[PDB]
Write a structure and sequence with these properties.
The protein has about 190 residues and is an alpha/beta fold. A six-stranded parallel beta sheet has the order 3-2-1-5-4-6, sandwiched between helices. The protein has a single domain, classed as Alpha/beta knot, CATH 3.40.1280. Helix content is about 35%, strand content about 15%. It is globular, with a radius of gyration of 16 Å. Belongs to the class IV-like SAM-binding methyltransferase superfamily. TRM10 family. It is found in: Cytoplasm; Nucleus.
């Protein structure tokens, strides 16, 4: 791709919620692990890089990572992995958390610089009905989906990966146009 303009970092924080390794087999972990790297690489070159968080980061996911990258991950900026839940890291900013979920009745129309956007670090999330709605709802936090229904077939929407959702958000900061952003990532 070709990026127009000067790189200005963003205040926004984006959290990969990695507490779902109960759910996946090894192959799915291996695949999640690659999508995590991919989020970081798209962040590395964004026009407006965020602070990327990996919460509840551990277990088979951390293992697969160190296995594949052999330590390069520790050199990643602006990248904050932590065993703590996003609920802990952001104890003082709970009302600033937004859990993204295709099942929300809310829709993002813009991202705010003061907010914290969560992506469930889960593969084939389609086997799990309302999985991320249930979780955030139970926590008292707001959920929202991306405003992309006019651009994606409902059966493809459910198939969007963790880096795809990240890339859409990152690319939105650059173009401030949800359709330019979406099209850049999908076709």
């Amino acid at each position: 791709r070709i990026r127009l303009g000067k790189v200005v970092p963003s205040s926004i924080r984006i959290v990969l919620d990695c507490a779902f390794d109960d759910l996946m087999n090894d192959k799915e972990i291996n695949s999640l692990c690659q999508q995590v790297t991919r989020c970081h690489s798209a962040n590395r070159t964004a026009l407006h890089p965020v602070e990327l968080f990996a919460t509840n980061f551990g277990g088979r996911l951390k293992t697969r990572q160190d296995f594949v990258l052999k330590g390069q991950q520790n050199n990643w900026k602006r990248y904050n992995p932590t065993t703590k839940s996003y609920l802990e890291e952001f104890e003082s900013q709970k009302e600033k958390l937004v859990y993204l979920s295709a099942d929300s009745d809310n829709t993002i129309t813009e991202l705010d610089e003061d907010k914290i956007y969560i992506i469930g670090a889960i593969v084939d999330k389609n086997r799990y009905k309302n999985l991320c709605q249930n979780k955030a709802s139970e926590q008292g936090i707001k959920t929202a989906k991306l405003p992309i229904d006019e651009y994606i077939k409902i059966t493809d929407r459910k198939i969007l990966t963790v880096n795809q959702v990240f890339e859409i958000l990152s690319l939105w900061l650059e173009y401030r146009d949800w359709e330019k952003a979406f099209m850049e990532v999908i076709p």
